[model samples]
Target: TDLKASSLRALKLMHLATDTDEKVIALCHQAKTPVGTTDAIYIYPRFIPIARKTLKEQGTPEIRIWTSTNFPHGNDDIDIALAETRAAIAYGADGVAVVFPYRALMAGNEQVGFDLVKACKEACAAANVLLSVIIETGELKDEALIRKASEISIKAGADHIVTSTGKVAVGATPESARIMMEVIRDMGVEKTVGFIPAGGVRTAEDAQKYLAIADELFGADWADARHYAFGASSLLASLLKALGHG
Candidate 1:
């Protein structure tokens, strides 16, 4: 496909990962999607209210508002994560991405991570909010551990799984995505668990790397806004510039 066509498809799966209201308003002006889909925005929990109101007031098509709990590091206590999620939804978030506790997994305790994800999912489900879990593969490090982390997150009812939080030394990579995709396609089959490659994805070229991985694993039609997304705040400019909107 050409750059315009490629950027459009990639933008369809773009989730603006930002905590700034200015960008939220900017997204409102710049982002418009078809009837069946919409772009998502990720924020820190503290910004949910303003982000929600901004998206509501100025947006043409409704842009999804999402917040993250226990961001960057997934080592917070379970109660903390749950409470944060509940409060984020109450603050007007339509969906939430959570940083799953991976230290427990590294220490050979998958149940700790599992229970945290389960509780978060239940809280999200209660409010009817979308839930995605960030496994933080940079910290997890091991390939097998990344696979196991994907299984635990999916089995515990995460509607989506994220690769990173952008706070680490290593961010999203095609290699990490390949393994995570394998888990979702294999274990997360009964449900359509979405994939997000957050942090460091700044260009259409960068976004396509992850999209290609999803296509290879999930099928050609599977890489839409619903099943695949990029948690990229800066990608919009690159996409727009590529399409001459910038």
Candidate 2:
């Protein structure tokens, strides 16, 4: 029960594609699996209304709602991104994940990247919404890039830094996960920056590995909802099956 409870607490159901009414219903149904299956649900902006209606009907009134802005690509104008963040907040998103401006960072225009995150941070803070910056580590491709992006986001006041967008050629790798966790560890507990591994985390074993890494690096308490999450759609089912709920 401890293992299941811990894993469930850190799970986030990512349904970024509800392009049609039908898809929205399907995603909402998928999200209604069981009450302790996930701590939060992240949906595409367009489906927030449907998700909110459906999920509440499914007996998950306490589930946190999350969404992303400048999604798969982290290159949107900072002002526009801020607008999106505000809109999501208005629509009842408890948390908003903003993609870190990868192009600006890679091109050495670090200020642009920092400003983007900072603006988003301010927007989320003003709206009383949580903010998580996605570094898109799969695209960043190495520890140095990941670390630099992370440091910039943390400095810009992001509450959490997620590894990978889960839409790129690669997702979360062990090495990438380790590097991000190490950066958060060095920042120390006082900083309170969270780490989330999104994309390609498709198994209970994969979730367990990342949890184990966080536990080993930051202690067992660090892997719960307040500090961690998985941005994976297939992962919750796998974790439930592995935990004997299947």
Candidate 3:
């Protein structure tokens, strides 16, 4: 309980698997208040433009908007994923997360992963938007494989490296998160690259473990939204409740 529990809420990459004017309107309202705030919100590419418009039209406060590409499967062509990145950025996304070609990497094809992130760097940098690479470390399974993917993502220019999409049941375990964290720390890029753990990180205690690890490795100064975040959907509600928000 030594942790500044409520302060961590500001580092949430809160999202729902969603698309709809109704939900966008709901989030826009939340964006206006302290009780329901997120550092960023993830929306689908097809819906991101409209969601950004809705947030602005409602005079809501800033909630960084992010959308993903090459989702469901991280095996798509880089051109297709890059096009999605460019489109989402053009539509006002503050950041874009593309699924890394992990299948190829798992097959000993590191070149695919490298080229994919390199392509996204150009599109994202041109617009001053953040680019996150979803590495699905859970599927990679092997600790060395997870470490390799984490290293590859950082070197190739991913602003953040996410463990897995929500679709995966075995997401974001302590083993994988630590391996990625170590890669960030050992590579001396802890300040530049952020780590986001999704799916299994569902409770206040669970979140503090990540906060603790970061505090241990990079120190508290690096614990902000820049170097550490929790990719969440239902987890946000739990976080808010822990801080006594209705």
Candidate 4:
């Protein structure tokens, strides 16, 4: 009775647990995260095998796999970006976090920048998954550019307008978060859009603060971690420590 009772109690305090070390797509399936047998969005090129292994271990409904293309650089030509997206998808990627061609957009080639996203989107769909274009507001250099990029991404069929690639000095910021929330809401796509601010934040309190803002801006009902999530690792650990658990 004590063992069973203790296990239940332990579980109650835990969030949905899974290892980032393993394939998240499969983990999402096991965790029942609604992605189902769909693909996964991953970081780094080296994780391809790990991703495939996870999917192979499960078999069937090969978890669609996706990775960040042109990553934080956001400087690669469309050919390279498109090729990388194609390779990852061919290998197993289902969705992709294609970085916005920031320099081009800033250089005033907004069409080319938006077209890069469209190409990636086409690849993901051809592979039967989705695309979440990373605008990296932190690099857009100004609020006007950020807004323009957001408008273009939504118009080009980006599944989610994410905050950052975490390759920059700041992964996600309040200003970037606000920009994403506003632009996506204004687009009114009525799709399963999400706002994931990766990096920098560190604490349930920090989370709650952003969440409070998200609630205020997006509506109180939309404040859950699923809809508006934090893409943080260090932040969560800090939160646990602050709660005296570390």
Q: Of the candidates shown, which would achieve the greatest TM-score relative to the real structure?
A: 1
Q: Once superposed on the true structure, which residue ranges of model 2 sit more than 4 Å away at CA?
A: 1-18, 35-37, 189-191, 231-233
**TM-scores across all candidates?**
0.90, 0.88, 0.90, 0.73
Note the clash tally of each candidate.
Answer: 0, 0, 0, 6
Cα error, residue 78 of model 2, in Å, equals 1.2
lDDT of 2 by residue, 1-246 (tens): 656755565454332222676776676666655544356667777777877887788876666677899787898498889888888888888889999988778777788888998988888899788889999998888678899998888889888888877788898887888888787777773247877787877776777777777777777665653455564446767766766766
Better of 1 and 4 by lDDT: 1
Q: What is the TM-score ranking, best to worst?
A: 1, 3, 2, 4
Worst 10 residues of 1 by lDDT: 29-38
Q: How far is candidate 1 from the true structure (C-alpha RMSD, Å)?
A: 2.5
lDDT to native, each model: 0.77, 0.75, 0.75, 0.61
Ranking by lDDT: 1, 2, 3, 4
* The candidate that achieves the highest lDDT relative to the unseen native structure: 1
Candidate 1: where are CA atoms >4 Å away? 19-24, 30-38, 188-191, 225-227, 231-233
Q: After superposition, how far is residue 144 of candidate 1 from its true place, in Å?
A: 0.4
